[PDB]
């Protein structure tokens, strides 16, 4: 005979009455013939019906078998043969479906196109039939949907559908909930936390912060200094987010002038710069990632001038000797100045040290003309030390120095002068014919020919004009010559005038009286 029983029922539950099926009143000495490790059954003498004495969990008995049966024999001592019975447990919904873990994740790439279905974790329910697993439901998401594959086997395969393309740069991971439902009401359920991990595709190219990097630096800039810093943006991950910087202008000398750190992207100075050589350095640099993805930006170096140059004087006209008769205003120097620098560093101030003798005049533009201020006189000063100082107007100031030595020429304006205003010479009567009797000296302040004395004598006729016959002088000896002997009784004294003239045109002359006195002797 067969019967049934609900699972997990308390001890003493109703089972098909045994006595009414055997054919005897509720003495009999009847006992159960089966043998288990433990037994869950015991017949009740109160009603003659078997009542279970232990909790029945067919999940711990038949597991997933659709029909769970417990067939056992029973023994009646009144008779000589046994009676075989069989009781099939039914299934109730007490177990909830279970997943493999509390947290499971699915890897999805960034390049994954919409329409891709990814396997979802499949749950398990110990129950059988309606009480077993029935359906799934997925939390709504803008990027995903749910897809179920029910089968003839009764098992459903769940998988998610990609609705919108994913992007890790906006959000790396998603958080969704997958719920599992059975059919045995009161229905159990099981939620499951799923994380959508987005992989990385190299779809981000490096993009520099600014499209143009600008720096303004002086020319005196020391090599090894840090010009600037260049940064590029790559939101990717790993080598796809790494940056490497290098110039695109690879052949010109600018590559030798600057240094660009391949990693840090620092623009530094390698060689000294010069505003006069070149002040506009336009270059184009480029950054790359792990792949061939690259970005460009322009770096512009602007150099500015610095006072590191001295003024340069070029002389056009020089007149080292000047005539002493020069009026105040005659030029003695003609030159100009020019600085290599620009602006206030290029303006020049040509200043002679203020002296009374000369003055400097800025005739036109920056051409300078050095002139005189008074009349010169080489008998008081024949030499002049001139120091023209050309200082630029920048800061700090740089001054070049031009030295001129000025020797004035000789113009004959000074006549020769004798040693005395008047000379007197004594000689006794006896006079050896043609002998020299005196010595007269003269001097001239001028130089060279304008100081060369040419001695002469006035031509006033003594009786018969023996001025030449009486006396003679040589142009250079400066000595007097008595030609004839003298008697105190013919003449006593003779007055002449000696002349001195400088031998150069125009000549300057000077006469001075000179008297010869004879002396008386024993005639
Ligand atoms: C303007 O300044 C210059 C120098 O800055 C003065 O020149 C003088 O020149 C002589 C040489 O010409 C200097 O030395 C001497 O040299 C001769 C040979 O030439 C030598 O024999 C001597 O033993 C001596 O070393 C001299 O030192 C130099 N300075 C002075 C003060 O005489 C020139 O005199 C200056 N002009 C005026 C108007 O002061
Ligand atoms: C001689 O000297 C006097 C005074 O120095 C001068 O006045 C006179 O003109 C001179 N004689 C001649 C011929 O120049
Ligand atoms: C899963 O869902 C069932 C039915 O919605 C609930 O009864 C259960 O408590 C869990 O929330
Ligand atoms: C769904 O809800 C259960 C509670 O029944 C959680 O344990 C689970 O992690 C998910 O959040
Ligand atoms: C000729 O010699 C006489 C001798 O007294 C000098 O006085 C004169 O100057 C000249 O040289
Ligand atoms: Ca159970
Ligand atoms: Ca069950
Ligand atoms: Ca269930
Ligand atoms: Ca992206
Ligand atoms: Ca990416
Ligand atoms: Ca990248
Ligand atoms: Ca320079
Ligand atoms: Ca300069
Ligand atoms: Ca300068
Ligand atoms: Ca003079
Ligand atoms: Ca000179
Ligand atoms: Ca003179
Ligand atoms: Ca003279
Ligand atoms: Ca005499
Ligand atoms: Ca005599």
Residue numbers in the entry: 3 to 28, 33 to 529
Report text from the authors:
By contrast, in vertebrates the clustered protocadherins (Pcdhs) provide analogous cell-surface diversity, but in this case generated through stochastic alternative promoter choice. Biophysical measurements with domain-deleted proteins showed that Pcdhs also interact in cis, through a membrane-proximal dimer interface involving extracellular cadherin domain 6 (EC6) and potentially EC5. The specificity-determining cell-cell recognition interface of Pcdhs involves domains EC1–4, as shown experimentally through mutagenesis analysis and suggested by mutation correlation analysis.
The γA isoform constructs—γA1EC1–4, γA4EC1–4, γA8EC1–4, γA9EC1–5—displayed dimer dissociation constants (KDs) of between 8.6 and 45.3 μM. Crystallization screening of these dimeric γ-Pcdh fragments yielded crystals of γA1EC1–4, γA8EC1–4, γA9EC1–5, γB2EC1–5, and γB7EC1–4, and their structures were determined by molecular replacement. X-ray diffraction by the γA9EC1–5 and γB7EC1–4 crystal form 1 crystals was significantly anisotropic and therefore the data was truncated using ellipsoidal limits for structure determination and refinement. The resolution of the final refined structures was 4.2 Å for γA1EC1–4, 3.6 Å for γA8EC1–4, 2.9/4.3/3.2 Å for γA9EC1–5, 3.5 Å for γB2EC1–5, 4.5/4.5/3.6 Å for γB7EC1–4 crystal form 1, and 3.1 Å for γB7EC1–4 crystal form 2. Unexpectedly the γA9EC1–5 crystal structure did not contain a trans dimer interaction in the crystal lattice. Given that γA9EC1–5 is a low micromolar dimer in solution, the monomeric arrangement in the crystal is likely an artifact of crystallization, perhaps due to the low pH (6.5) of the crystallization condition. We also found examples of small/large interacting residue pairs at the interface which showed correlated variations between isoforms such that heterophilic complexes would likely generate steric clashes: For example, EC1:EC4 residues 86 and 369 from γB isoforms, EC2:EC3 residues 125 and 253 of γB4 and γB5 (γB7 numbering), and EC1:EC4 residues 79 and 340 of γA8 and γA9.
